[PDB]
């Protein structure tokens, strides 16, 4: 019984930043820098830990579900974006693997 967004904040989002692969992740995807015209086109929906992290900072999040859904999106948009395989694809399928991990010991 504590609550589910403190816990997202302090404890899943903390152990995701300080991963050796969280720093692709900590914020969006520059697609001017990289040279990724297509980035934006196909991704309608961009997230990164960056945001997420202002969001739980801000109270911008109705629930823990929303906050949820949206370390959702960042994995999907980067499977989405790469080719299976890609660095950066690894990279997230273990950020993805310790976010699951971690919510199953979610408060409720
Ligand atoms: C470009 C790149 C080279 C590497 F050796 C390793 C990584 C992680 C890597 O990816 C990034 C490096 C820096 C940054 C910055 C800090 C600018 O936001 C972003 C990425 C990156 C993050 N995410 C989530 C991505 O989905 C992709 C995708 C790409 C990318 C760049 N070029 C490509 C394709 C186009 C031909 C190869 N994909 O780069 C990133």
Redesign the pocket.
């Known amino acids: 019984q504590t609550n589910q967004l403190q816990y997202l904040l302090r404890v899943v989002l903390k152990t995701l930043w300080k991963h050796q692969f969280a720093?692709?992740?900590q914020?969006?995807?520059?697609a001017v820098?990289?040279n990724?015209p297509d980035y934006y086109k196909i991704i309608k929906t961009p997230m990164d830990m960056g945001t997420i992290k202002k969001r739980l900072e801000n109270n911008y999040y109705w629930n823990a579900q929303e906050c949820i859904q949206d370390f959702n999106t960042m994995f999907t948009n980067?499977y989405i974006?790469?080719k299976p395989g890609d660095?950066?694809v690894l990279?997230a399928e273990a950020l993805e693997k310790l976010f699951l991990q971690k919510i199953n010991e979610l408060p409720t």
Request: some cysteine; hydrophobic content about 45%; aromatic content about 18%.
């Open positions: 720093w692709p992740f914020q969006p995807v520059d820098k990289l990724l980067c974006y790469n660095d950066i990279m």
